[model samples]
Target: GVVLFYGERLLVTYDGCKLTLSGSGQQPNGKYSGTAYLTSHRVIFLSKDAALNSLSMPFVFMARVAIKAPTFGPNHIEGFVSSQWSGEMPFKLVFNHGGAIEFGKSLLELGTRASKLQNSYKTPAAPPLCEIYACPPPAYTPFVNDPYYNSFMQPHPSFSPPPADYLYQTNSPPPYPGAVPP
Candidate 1:
């Protein structure tokens, strides 16, 4: 276990690192947060912070875990059981503020034989295969040309510039149904 600062390089082993992820703060204070994890090789980092709460107010809470035999190879795997809430609001708050826990780390390696077979080798396999989870399809929104056509006050000019208050004036009813004022 060691601490490597920015621009510094570390020579870590495979045993792995132990990280204590913590966060805390009140509705009017700053947020404190930090993460400690190992390299594919066993190297641990345990870090802490006191002024990390400034990011958000209200009550702040975070997660902490302990990973065993955490392997970081072509595929990284670690078991985690986290702290959670089962209720609501101030009364429903939970914290992993302090306790015994483990930390883990994963590196991007190659793919597995199964993945190579599934992808058909047409393209190279992705790194860190096991950690990749499928994502849901995205929602698409079509481009709208005239969002205010229903309330356009006049048809003076679709392309010509108008007065600074043109939009304010257009807030009123149009001259005719679905038609701009002359």
Candidate 2:
């Protein structure tokens, strides 16, 4: 059966090795170490223990919620085929590397390889759009053990400090240098 994604499902499969993977496109490349088949569908692959035999180790599935290149807003779903027979091979379906980053580094490499095969002849090299959200800055509190702030950053301070400035007070004029400013 082939894999698919119809909204809720992260992975789905059809009767004849057709597969679909639907995800945030942040992760790509799902791992399967049992038995599987890569069917006619370019972007989908299927794994099953029946044809390829049982796995020596447990299979781990991952995916890359594909991003729309430099934009990184709308991400497509795609992945590869892995199992006992093929020894873990990736088949790219969407914009390439669309499956694994969300999954992990190993999967990301698979997507990278698939992308190469898909877009090999192009004049310009096509690289995966690996954009990621920036890590949030640490909260004002320097210590976690202190009871002043909760895990959610709620304040329990005895005297609450003024709220952090959202913007500088640029609209007001500067104090006069020589005059006795009020």
Candidate 3:
């Protein structure tokens, strides 16, 4: 066994850096300057500071990330992440040696692949509701459009958005039930 997990790769590293968790007010562990390393599945920071001696973030749990640039300081990365061991919070990564933009881009790009890899390993979800409609779905659901010929609120629109197919992998409801029921 090794410090690095199987299939995991050490992709990038930065020598001078500090980090903070804004959402949780993580106190000691939230504030620290350290050496940050980026790997295939996680971001690890090694520091001399107690409480923040080491902090690692898995791409699996992070959300809504970004890049930051200051007039005086170098570039940095910011994003929210969650863990059952604690809770959720926004994390900031400031690079002292100047690679924030590149690092941020690297992270985002690396994470995209990580996201896909995780999804491929995820448990399949059960089927969606019959009433639900959207995306390039197979179920042909129909709404009782303009019933009685004189109702006030003519709710629903014309089979909303995109052509028959979609690039989105997530759920989208189906349109007016096919003229012929399945």
The TM-score between candidate 3 and the true structure equals 0.58
TM-score of each: 0.16, 0.17, 0.58
Compose the digit string of candidate 2's lDDT tens values, residues 83-136.
314333443333222322232222233334333443232223323442222211
* Order of quality (lDDT): 3, 2, 1
What is the lDDT, from 0 to 100, of the residue 157 in candidate 1?
Answer: 15
- Residues 45-116, candidate 3: write the lDDT tens digits: 777457546676778677888886678866679887865345668789886666577667767765655655
Clashing pairs in 3: 133-173, 133-174, 134-172, 134-173, 134-174, 141-177, 142-177
Give candidate 2's whole-model lDDT.
Answer: 0.26
Residues 1-182 of candidate 1 have per-residue lDDT tens digits of 13222111111121221222222232222222233222211122222445331121010121222223326522222222122332221211111332112111211111111122332323223344233122111100111233322122112111122112211111121111111111
**Model 1 spans > 4 angstroms off:** 1-33, 50-182
Error of 3 at 112 (Å): 1.1
Model 2 TM: 0.17
| C-alpha lDDT values of all predictions | 0.20, 0.26, 0.53
Clashes of each: 20, 37, 7
Please rank every candidate by TM-score, starting with the best.
3, 2, 1
